[PDB]
């Protein structure tokens, strides 16, 4: 469907394809055409054997009201201006990422640390501890400007 009914060339819903919880779907039943009483002739195109139980095909996507933004670009804009980042991350609201700019930071799992999840990424850090006078100069030079000890 969609693009010229070429079908087997990708996803018809490229964003909805990789979503952890997609929107609920409505299996509608169309009001056909003719009223409740009329004879129907079997046209010589179908078969006397029954039609498909067309349940997974009559579909339509209804919106959902997530508490992030109520499907409204204007509220999205004052959230962006207020700099309130969304709660669930791209590793949570999606599957493996859609855009390629989400690849930096795709290994981050919030529930488990990286060292526990895979132990082969452990690098022992070699850092020199800051001494007492270096800590003193560092904490003082932030607060004051006209003071210097050798």
């Amino acid at each position: 469907m969609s693009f010229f009914n070429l079908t087997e060339l990708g996803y018809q819903y490229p964003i909805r394809a990789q979503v952890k919880e997609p929107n609920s779907v409505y299996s509608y039943h169309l009001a056909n055409s003719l009223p409740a009483g009329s004879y129907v002739s079997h046209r010589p195109e179908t078969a006397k054997l029954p039609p498909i139980n067309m349940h997974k095909y009559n579909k339509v996507i209804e919106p959902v009201d997530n508490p992030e933004h109520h499907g409204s670009y204007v509220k999205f804009t004052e959230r962006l201006h207020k700099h309130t980042r969304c709660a669930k991350g791209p590793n949570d609201i999606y599957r493996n990422p859609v855009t390629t700019a989400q690849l930096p930071g795709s290994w981050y799992r919030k529930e488990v640390p990286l060292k526990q999840s895979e132990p082969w990424t452990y690098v022992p850090r070699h850092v020199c501890v800051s001494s007492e006078m270096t800590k003193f100069v560092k904490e003082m030079s932030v607060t004051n400007r006209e003071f210097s000890l050798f």
Binding site: L49, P50, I52, N53
Partner: peptide
């Protein structure tokens, strides 16, 4: 494919 197999077994 379930429904057509019913008439397949029928005849």
């Amino acid at each position: 494919l379930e429904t057509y197999h019913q008439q397949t077994l029928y005849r």
